[PDB]
Design a protein around this ligand. Structure first.
Ligand SMILES: *[C@@H]1O[C@H](CO)[C@@H](O[C@@H]2O[C@H](CO)[C@@H](O[C@@H]3O[C@H](CO)[C@@H](O)[C@H](O)[C@@H]3O)[C@H](O)[C@H]2NC(C)=O)[C@H](O)[C@H]1NC(C)=O
Ligand SMILES: CC#CCn1c(N2CCC[C@@H](N)C2)nc2c1c(=O)n(Cc1nc(C)c3ccccc3n1)c(=O)n2C
Ligand SMILES: CC#CCn1c(N2CCC[C@@H](N)C2)nc2c1c(=O)n(Cc1nc(C)c3ccccc3n1)c(=O)n2C
Ligand SMILES: *[C@@H]1O[C@H](CO)[C@@H](O[C@@H]2O[C@H](CO)[C@@H](O)[C@H](O)[C@H]2NC(C)=O)[C@H](O)[C@H]1NC(C)=O
Ligand SMILES: *[C@@H]1O[C@H](CO)[C@@H](O[C@@H]2O[C@H](CO)[C@@H](O)[C@H](O)[C@H]2NC(C)=O)[C@H](O)[C@H]1NC(C)=O
Ligand SMILES: *[C@@H]1O[C@H](CO)[C@@H](O[C@@H]2O[C@H](CO)[C@@H](O)[C@H](O)[C@H]2NC(C)=O)[C@H](O)[C@H]1NC(C)=O
Ligand SMILES: *[C@@H]1O[C@H](CO)[C@@H](O)[C@H](O)[C@H]1NC(C)=O
Ligand SMILES: *[C@@H]1O[C@H](CO)[C@@H](O)[C@H](O)[C@H]1NC(C)=O
Ligand SMILES: *[C@@H]1O[C@H](CO)[C@@H](O)[C@H](O)[C@H]1NC(C)=O
Ligand SMILES: *[C@@H]1O[C@H](CO)[C@@H](O)[C@H](O)[C@H]1NC(C)=O
Lengths: 721, 719
């Protein structure tokens, strides 16, 4: 064979895709996995042997795409008829299979379509959502008991989140949680009745288009109301569902429900977040026997507030409880402003700092009897790497071990972990910089037992490909460090002038300079079209302390734009960039940033591309916008909501080539955002190129993705030649 | 001295003025002068006086006026709020001219959808919240005629969306009798019609949905009931329904138009939903029952075995002074639309005009004369000349008033007649600079020049305008008339890039002797391009064989005829076969898209502005007229085969530019949304542009942006 450059076709077909192995743990030494001919194999690590538990002929009999083994292993649910709704939500038909009998569960059949379904943590209890209502099945073939009755489509939601909670708050399709032993079922009740709706046309394949209404609260609009209830699953008819008391300081004004964490069958932990998202409350509630309800004392309310910015990051960090079920470990900012692990027993005041330094603790994976596992930046001071650490708890001389630092140093510096029951064994998934690799380790010695997915097919395929060189370096301008990823063309010469493309996102709590392997569009642009690509992380980006993160608080569309400009000026003075041929592209938040950078009036960028951009913070969800911007009122931050729009910079797009793209059925960043930019450019008498994608979601999935990346390539090749 | 610039076209620098007198009597007319005073001019005693001052108009921000026939009052129209093509809502103020003060009292409500005076006296008729009200005297409390008017459902006195656009082409649906004794009105019911919903972004946090009851091809149609009310005693017997003919009511139907003959005689025109047959029913008033009798003996059928009834509309009759007979334009034995004279029956109709040319419109039927416009002169179908023929005199007369009035300059006319045709005005639209003159209605002599356009004549002195030529091609027994616009200092030895401007819809004509300084004049004047406009099968005024050729076969012959013409223009030697383009709007957007995806390799690039993509998405009134019903028993097969989306894979080696306004109520954005979706599925690249919150015509700074964007696309395509 002969070495060849990447093609656009290779990227669109996903020829250089990688496989990942996350074991579906069922016990401390057992896990499930789908085989090549679609069977379900049960691998036991201690015994070393595997067996088929659910055959391909049983899955094909009902056109099943997914499965779910019950904890007691008596039954397995068969998921078929997947019908996607929003980012996480989907509807499906569920078939219970009796493994012990060798036949499907016939009788009090499950309805269709089911919005969410799950087993209890022990036994064969079932909980499901149908027509925004929760139902309970003690045994698979038993008639269901209806828990909720007010569920109405697009108005009252039970057991599943509404649009805004699914997207910006919970980031999941469910809103119900079983207690550790299935004694209680906790759930949430969302009321979207008075929220204004977003309406958009869906053309489809019928003579007339249909309107799609979604209750969506834009910045400052009426928000949904939430009521968390806990019902006794053993005797639901006795006292019924009990509402969980909301803390006095949370209920004083509008509030959000952050997350629910079960501690024991008689103790649950709820997190609340005031509408002004700079103060969160961790309330611990205990079950009482004299009232059959949940008592929430003032003594068990732990406040976490941020005087500089917002509480947490994308979410308010969840606590990981100790074996004693009274104390917990949580990640939050220290005195210096770095998000580190703390240990809280009684009160927040007496919290003990577990990790410290000019780096951040990202996630706590497991809190065992003697070990604590977590991921961090620490290794070699690179904020874009992720490594797994293991620290001792309770032992007199403490231990601290980096499991993955030197596991495969050159190839692997971005890991994630998946723990078996009680951390007896665990799996590490390496995502880059090299070819991703999934391995399985002993939970006591950290030793690698076997390679789950090595990716030898992708390694051989890439042999004859001229992949670009990726470099993660930093710039130090005016006490502000800018980390950047530069993608260089094959056979790169520091004496030549290369056209430059900037890929931007820059949204608060984000990070785009990571040691992650990816064979994407910008890899093709550097491999075949000889372009230099750059990704810069400035103010507002996460994992480098709160001074960097909270710098964009109430000032969106200002520093993230300036930092891309500062970086381009620095890349130009390196000598290998053609100052005449520079471009910037982005999607969503990156579409807002590239539009503002292109209309900055600096003359650095020749052309720019904005895909589904945000044009004004008055058009985005209250949950995201108000977290980083505040209220759009005269008494608060209305002034900056008006000054931070793309439409106010319309006259500045006169000598630059602008390409504006947006999907007509975008439920997340509505088409209204691009419709307003286009209207402002028309009024300003400014020429630009545009593209719409009919009936397409925010991500433009399908043949639209092909068309988009082809259309953008044509625009860049014209701009650069 | 200098070439035209895009800015000159966008600003309307080379615009022309037109003078249509607002007749009030047989020798008088009103006109809003330079200082915005309403002046009255008398032709006989050549005197003028200001009847409504600029101070009176400015006091209520008035943009329009309406003098009552008795001249006691004048309505002052202000707060104009456009709705659809013709409809608008405004505030009206009655001014008492005799007293010198505004009419105080039972004030008119706001906003009023339509308002008009009776043909005599001070009677008022107006539509408010889809209901008709009557004011005997301006300061009197109104008498409510209708009560069922509900927004977007029941319409009274005004048409619904589809009747306003495709059927009446007017903002009103009420007609006063010749002396104001009776008021006739329409009642439209859109209750079960499916609606078209589209987002209107506006300037608020959330966009709003706009719903319009719009019947697409084959969908449920609005129902119509016509009534007549005695305006002297409307409480006595009330509104009486006009009997619908037995053969019209048998299935779905349309009300075509209403024509008052005398106070006690009215003429109604009906159209069957299968638009190949129309009925002219004459109804008389009966004292005995105070109702309208419509006999079978007074039903005149007009059917078309080859195609549809009429042109864009079913021609209206013009009655004689005897009020029993009438003159109507329709096809003869040979297939040419000529004037006929009907006394008793359609069978015994007498053909008034004949030949291989068409009579376009009947302007006025007087006691001894008949005025009409036609093609006849020098056999040019794109010309309009006004003729006068005698009626009643033993040896008949026939003269062409306009033919040699100004032969080189003027060959496209229109006429505005004063009360009883005592005087009339001729408006020349081209080929030369438009001119409006005033003629004596008895001798046809020119009395004065109303608007000569000397400002535009002087402005164009230093402008080297392109040469326009109207010629014809004769291929396979089919004559194609074309207008070619040549660059200044055109050389027949050089190769020039070619742009085709297309419309090609049924009943249309784009090769006319009309003066215009438009976008394509700039493209030829500054960008050295040859421009062409071809009229093939489906275009009107050349007989029914040409017109009905596209019957039930839309998107086929009009496309082929543009291709046949380009092949002929190429073999002329001065066209660069490598640089050819085609642009069109609306129907022209459908034709240019199909021509670009024909697979002939003639066109390099094409532009489609607000195109129709499938006949499933367009108005039933227009679509089922030339294509029939989209059912298995009728023409569903061709409805499916005549789509732009079915030709998606053919746009692969051509440059396509697709433009469409998001708030287009006429040709919905759905049409372009479907084309874009098909091109994505076919993996075909194209350039696109949307216009937020803009109507079908993209009026305002959106026009500026569109014409600029299209110029860039063509400049790039022709380099
Ligand atoms: C846009 O087009 C309009 C015409 O539709 C232009 O308005 C006209 O501009 C010309 C030249 O500036 C004016 O002509 C001069 O008028 C004076 C009397 O006012 C006369 O003494 C001169 O001999 C000459 O004819 C004209 O008055 C003016 N207005 C009208 C009603 O025609 C306008 O200027 C164009 N815009 C641009 C930017 O060119
Ligand atoms: C508007 C907005 C917004 C903010 N936002 C969020 N949040 C948190 C989660 C909830 C969400 N509502 C808001 N997640 C995001 C982004 C974002 O702009 N981009 C850029 C981006 N996005 C996409 C889709 C891209 C696709 C291709 C290339 C680069 C891309 N870059 C992202 O990638 N992700 C994952
Ligand atoms: C779909 C469709 C359609 C049919 N249509 C109608 N009818 C009768 C009245 C009722 C209506 N529903 C249907 N009037 C039309 C057209 C049409 O295609 N074009 C072409 C055109 N249109 C526009 C707007 C143009 C603008 C610029 C240049 C060329 C243009 N060429 C016209 O000019 N006019 C005046
Ligand atoms: C699209 O990409 C897939 C891989 O994602 C290609 O399929 C592979 O083809 C090679 C050919 O040697 C096989 O050995 C692999 O086993 C295939 N992998 C999978 C996952 O099927 C496919 O060929 C690509 N499409 C095209 C047209 O090249
Ligand atoms: C307007 O049209 C609607 C629908 O065609 C009429 O309503 C129907 O009238 C019939 C007869 O009175 C009833 O039996 C139906 O149940 C009605 N259907 C609906 C959908 O309402 C309505 O009466 C008409 N109104 C006028 C004033 O003509
Ligand atoms: C008017 O047009 C209609 C079209 O629907 C003609 O009706 C057809 O007549 C035949 C007679 O055998 C029927 O079988 C069909 O169902 C009808 N439609 C078609 C096109 O198949 C009607 O005859 C025409 N009338 C006139 C006077 O020309
Ligand atoms: C939901 O909210 C509406 C409107 O605010 C209110 O009327 C109703 O009581 C609520 N319903 C439930 C079940 O919470
Ligand atoms: C939280 O935000 C509000 C509004 O900006 C501010 O007034 C308040 O003091 C902040 N609270 C803390 C603890 O920072
Ligand atoms: C508005 O925003 C611009 C940046 O887009 C900034 O330069 C200006 O100072 C802001 N403030 C006001 C009051 O305009
Ligand atoms: C109003 O008309 C008078 C008389 O023609 C004139 O003098 C005056 O200038 C006009 N005012 C305006 C505003 O045109």
């Amino acid at each position: 064979n002969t070495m060849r450059a990447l093609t656009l076709k290779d990227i669109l077909n996903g020829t250089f895709s990688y496989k990942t192995f996350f074991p579906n743990w069922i016990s401390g030494q057992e896990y499930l996995h789908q085989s090549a001919d679609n069977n379900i194999v049960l691998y036991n690590i201690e015994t070393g042997q595997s067996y088929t538990i659910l055959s391909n002929r049983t899955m094909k009999s009902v056109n099943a795409s997914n499965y779910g083994l019950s904890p007691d292993r008596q039954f397995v649910y068969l998921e078929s008829d997947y019908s996607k709704l929003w980012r996480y939500s989907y509807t499906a038909t569920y078939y219970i299979y009796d493994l012990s009998n060798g036949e499907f569960v016939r009788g009090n059949e499950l309805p269709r379509p089911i919005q969410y379904l799950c087993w209890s943590p022990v036994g064969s209890k079932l909980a499901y959502v149908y027509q925004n209502n929760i139902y309970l099945k003690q045994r698979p073939g038993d008639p269901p008991f209806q828990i909720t009755f007010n569920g109405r489509e697009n108005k009252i939601f039970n057991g599943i989140p509404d649009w805004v909670y699914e997207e910006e708050m919970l980031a999941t399709k469910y809103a119900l949680w079983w207690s550790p032993n299935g004694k209680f079922l906790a759930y949430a009740e969302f009321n979207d009745t008075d929220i204004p709706v977003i309406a958009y046309s869906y053309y489809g394949d019928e003579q007339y288009p249909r309107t799609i209404n979604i209750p969506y609260p834009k910045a400052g609009a009426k928000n949904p109301v939430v009521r968390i209830f806990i019902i006794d699953t053993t005797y639901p008819a006795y006292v019924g569902p009990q509402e969980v008391p909301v803390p006095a300081m949370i209920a004083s004004s509008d509030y959000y429900f952050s997350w629910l964490t079960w501690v024991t069958d008689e103790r649950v932990c709820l997190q609340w977040l005031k509408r002004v998202q700079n103060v969160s409350v961790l309330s611990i509630c205990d079950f009482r026997e004299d009232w059959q309800t949940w008592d929430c004392p003032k003594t068990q309310e732990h406040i976490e507030e941020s005087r500089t910015g917002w509480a947490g990051g994308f979410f308010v960090s969840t606590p990981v409880f100790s074996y004693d079920a009274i104390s917990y470990y949580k990640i939050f900012s220290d005195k210096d402003g770095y998000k580190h692990i703390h240990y809280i027993k009684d009160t927040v005041e007496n919290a003990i700092q577990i990790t410290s330094g000019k780096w951040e603790a990202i996630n706590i994976f497991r809190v065992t009897q003697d070990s604590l596992f977590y991921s961090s930046n620490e290794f070699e001071e690179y904020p874009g790497r992720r490594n797994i650490y293991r620290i001792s708890i309770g032992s007199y001389p403490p231990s601290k071990k980096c499991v993955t630092c030197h596991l495969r140093k050159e190839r692997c510096q971005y890991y994630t972990a998946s723990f078996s029951d009680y951390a007896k064994y665990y799996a590490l998934v390496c995502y880059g910089p090299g070819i991703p690799i999934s391995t399985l380790h002993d939970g006591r010695t950290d030793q690698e037992i076997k390679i789950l997915e090595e990716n030898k097919e992708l390694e051989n395929a890439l042999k004859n490909i001229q992949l670009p060189k990726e470099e993660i370096k930093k710039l130090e301008v005016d006490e502000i460090t800018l980390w950047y990823k530069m993608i260089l063309p094959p056979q790169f010469d520091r004496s030549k002038k290369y056209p430059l493309l900037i890929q931007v996102y820059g949204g608060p709590c984000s990070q785009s300079v990571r040691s992650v392997f990816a064979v994407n569009w910008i890899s093709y642009l550097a491999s075949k079209e000889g372009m230099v690509i750059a990704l810069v992380d400035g103010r507002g980006t996460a994992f480098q302390g709160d001074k960097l993160l909270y710098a964009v608080y109430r000032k969106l569309g200002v520093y993230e734009v300036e930092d891309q400009i500062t970086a381009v000026r620095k890349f130009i003075e390196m000598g290998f960039i053609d100052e005449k041929r520079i471009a910037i592209w982005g999607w969503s938040y990156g579409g807002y940033v590239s539009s503002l950078a292109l209309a900055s009036g600096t003359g650095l960028f020749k052309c720019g591309i904005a895909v589904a951009p945000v044009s004004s913070w008055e058009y985005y969800a209250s949950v995201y916008t108000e977290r980083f911007m505040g209220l759009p009122t005269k008494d608060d931050n209305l002034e900056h909501y008006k000054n931070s729009t793309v439409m106010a910079r319309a006259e500045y797009f006169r000598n630059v080539d602008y390409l504006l793209i947006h999907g007509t059925a975008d439920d997340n960043v509505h088409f209204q955002n691009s419709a307003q930019i286009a209207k402002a450019l028309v009024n300003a008498q400014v020429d630009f190129q545009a593209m719409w994608y009919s009936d397409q979601n925010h991500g433009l999935s399908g043949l639209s993705t092909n068309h988009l990346y082809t259309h953008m390539t044509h625009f860049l090749k014209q701009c650069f030649s």
